Every structure is written in structure tokens, then in C-alpha cells.
Amino acid sequence: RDAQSVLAAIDNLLPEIRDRAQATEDLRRLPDETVKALDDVGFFTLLQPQQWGGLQCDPALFFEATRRLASVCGSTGWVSSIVGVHNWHLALFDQRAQEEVWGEDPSTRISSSYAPMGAGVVVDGGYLVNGSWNWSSGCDHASWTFVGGPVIKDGRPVDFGSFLIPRSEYEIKDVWYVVGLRGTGSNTLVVKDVFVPRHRFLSYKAMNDHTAGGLATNSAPVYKMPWGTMHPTTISAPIVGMAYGAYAAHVEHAEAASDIDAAWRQLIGNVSDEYALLAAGKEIPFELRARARRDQVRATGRSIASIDRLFEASGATALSNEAPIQRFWRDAHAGRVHAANDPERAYVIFGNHEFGLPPGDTMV
């Protein structure tokens, strides 16, 4: 079993997922059956390190899988991209954190809410974490979470990064009643006085430094991809895929099909350019990372324009609750509102360690 065969297995899975699209929406979280299928097929394995049975794959393939899923159910491609890429992010934590998550069951999953809605206060051996973090897509299908925030020491921020916390230490609050991406169950994680040892914190500085502890044991070049590319592409790729779905909803019933194609080639082109340099042991130029950032909005912007045109060119029946196209329209738009509210848009401007953050140019 390999990257290519997982992709094929996913292709085979699409009709089932398409027929439960509306069910998924009504549930407000992915059906266990979708999650079980994705697991069985090896999807969560794609960016997971080899030492845990994972395929540490070309990131372009991982994002292609998310595009396929999204083309059939916006919510499913969204949750899959986000929860699958967390296996990439965990590969960068020190080896003991990876063991604690994967050492018994390597199919264990990890959710996130990286927005700074809490903080870790330095205590002996780690941090005491408190906060209430919203928007954790797929959190009902993960037994660990990341939560983002600053580290506070002697009453001041000194660092910023992600805290890894097991499910027994947080509560999920069901708040997910929304206009689109309804089936993502992007619920709220409530964290009260939870001790987190240092080995289960990973600083944004270290990730962008190439000094993340996971890199000593996980050497595949995909783990050297920049955070500033992997993180927004996680969101952009399914949104592009939802445009493929809107288009196929419009057939099954101008420049559209090809404006969508061009949005895809641009988004993924930056990923493979980046990866091709790492696989040849070269460095990724800042200019390339800056270019990939600007193309996030160009590509989701082009996709969503195509979706709006299609939505308005599908008969009056387009407005019906019973109509796939309005679902892909709502889901892509919900996605872009999430994207447009991303606090890293601002982090990139910081140059002076504000709130424990790394130099902004490292975040690009």
C-alpha cells in the first residue's frame, strides 16, 4: 500500500460519501462510517511518519485526496484535510509526545484550535493551560487536541505555540449551528487548569527554525515543509475541491471549469515547487513562501467566483434545500470566512516577539 493506492481507494469511496452528504449535514459532524472508511483505506496514514506505519507522502498527494473528498461533501474534505494534516504537525513534536499519542494505537487522531483563545502559564516541568477554544473541526473523532496560545512566565508572554492535550483533560461543548460546513462539528474545547509537560508543547519559533524536536527522528523531506504553506493550504485545498463539486452538481441536472482548474494548478503548484526543492536537499526561498501566501486568496477567490456563477446558472431549483449546489456554495463560503478570520494574517506583520510570537517573516 502506497500513496497512489490510498488515492485510488479514496476515489472508490466518493459515491458513498456523496450519497450521505445531506445526512452528514444533519448530523453536524462526520458519520462514524465515513471516518472508519477513511481510516480503513489508509487516508490518515498519508502524512504520518513511517515509524508509526505512516506513508510520510508527497504533500501534493495529500492535498489532492482532500480535493477529491471535498468535491463530493464539503464537510468531509474539510475535516479530513484538517485532521489528516495534524499527523504531519505531530511528527514535529518531540519523540515522547509522538509515543504518547501513537505508541499503542497509531491510528489515534488529533484535532486542533490553533487560534489564541487561552494560554499556558509556566509551572515546574511544563505549563498550566486554561482557555476556551472554538472551531475544532472533527474534534468528536480525535482523542487528543492541539490548542494554540502564548506561554506566560513571571507575568509576561515569552513564547507561543501549540499544547498537546489528551481527551480526558478537556471538555467538548456542542455549539455548532452554522450557515455552512455544518457537518464539520467544529465545536469548542474547554480547558481548565490542565498541566502540560514541556515535551507536549511545540513552539512556532522551533517549527520555523528547523529545530522542532520531531525532526531528529522523522527525516522525510515533507516534515521540512513550511508551516506558512501547509497550514493555509489545509483550508484552501478543500475549498477549491468544493468548486469541483459545485461544477459537477451543475452538470448532473463557461470559463468556470477551467478557472477552477487554474485555481487548483496555482495552489498545488506552490506545494510541489516547495517539496521539489526539499526532496533535492535545497532550501525554500522566502520569495516562494511569500508567493504561496498570496496565492491562497487568489485561488480560493477564483474558485468561489466560479461557484457563485454556477449557483446562479442552475435554474430556480438551485435555491432548494434539496439541491447539492447550494450546499457546496454555502460550504465554500463558510470556508472562506474561516480563512479570512485567520489570526496568522496578522502574525506575519509582527517583528518584535509580540505575545511570544516568532519574527513574522518566519510565519509567511
Residues 151-210 interacting with its own copies (rule: CB under 8 A): 152, 154-157, 177-181, 193
| Backbone angles phi and psi of 215, in degrees to 5 | -70, -25
| Backbone angles phi and psi of 251, in degrees to 5 | -60, -65
- In angstroms, the CA 279 to CA 84 distance is 21
Note whether 326 binds its own copies by CB under 8 A. yes
With vertex at residue 191, the alpha carbon angle to CA 190 and CA 192, rounded to the nearest 5 degrees, is: 120
Cβ 318 to its own copies shortest distance, Å? 6
Q: Please check if 338 is assigned to a binding site.
A: yes
Note whether 354 binds its own copies by CB under 8 A. yes
Note whether 126 binds its own copies by CB under 8 A. no
Among 15, 124, 252, 254, binds its own copies (CB under 8 A): 254
Which 3 state secondary structure label does DSSP give 256?
helix
Note whether 350 binds its own copies by CB under 8 A. yes
Among 94, 159, 338, 363, binds its own copies (CB under 8 A): 338
Which of the ranges 76-84, 96-104, 266-274, 341-349 carries the binding residues for its own copies, by CB under 8 A?
Answer: 341-349
Q: Which is nearer to its own copies, 53 or 285 (CB)?
A: 285
Contact 160, 343 (CB under 8 A): no
Note whether 277 binds its own copies by CB under 8 A. no
- In angstroms, the CA 265 to CA 260 distance is 9
Q: Please check if 339 is assigned to a binding site.
A: yes
Q: Which is nearer to its own copies, 172 or 339 (CB)?
A: 339
Radius of gyration of the CA atoms of the chain, in A = 20
Note whether 23 binds its own copies by CB under 8 A. no
Q: Which is nearer to its own copies, 37 or 200 (CB)?
A: 200
Among 17, 206, 334, 363, binds its own copies (CB under 8 A): 334
Note whether 345 binds its own copies by CB under 8 A. yes
Among 49, 77, 138, 149, binds its own copies (CB under 8 A): 149
Size of the site for its own copies (CB under 8 A): 72
Cβ 114 to its own copies shortest distance, Å? 12
Residue pointed to by grid coordinates 521540512 = 224
- In angstroms, the CA 240 to CA 67 distance is 7
Q: Please check if 137 is assigned to a binding site.
A: yes
Note whether 74 binds its own copies by CB under 8 A. no
How many other C-beta atoms can be found within 10 angstroms of the C-beta atom of residue 193? 10
Name 192's Cβ contacts closer than 8 Å, sequence gap at least 6: 130
For the four alpha carbons of 357, 149, 50 and 82, in that order, the dihedral sign comes to negative
Mark out the alpha helices in the chain (DSSP H runs): 3-27, 32-40, 59-70, 74-90, 95-102, 204-209, 227-251, 256-278, 286-311, 324-340, 344-347
Note whether 343 binds its own copies by CB under 8 A. yes
Q: Please check if 114 is assigned to a binding site.
A: yes
Note whether 116 binds its own copies by CB under 8 A. yes
Among 44, 135, 170, 328, binds its own copies (CB under 8 A): 135
- List residues forming the annotated binding site: 78, 112-114, 135-137, 316-317, 338-339
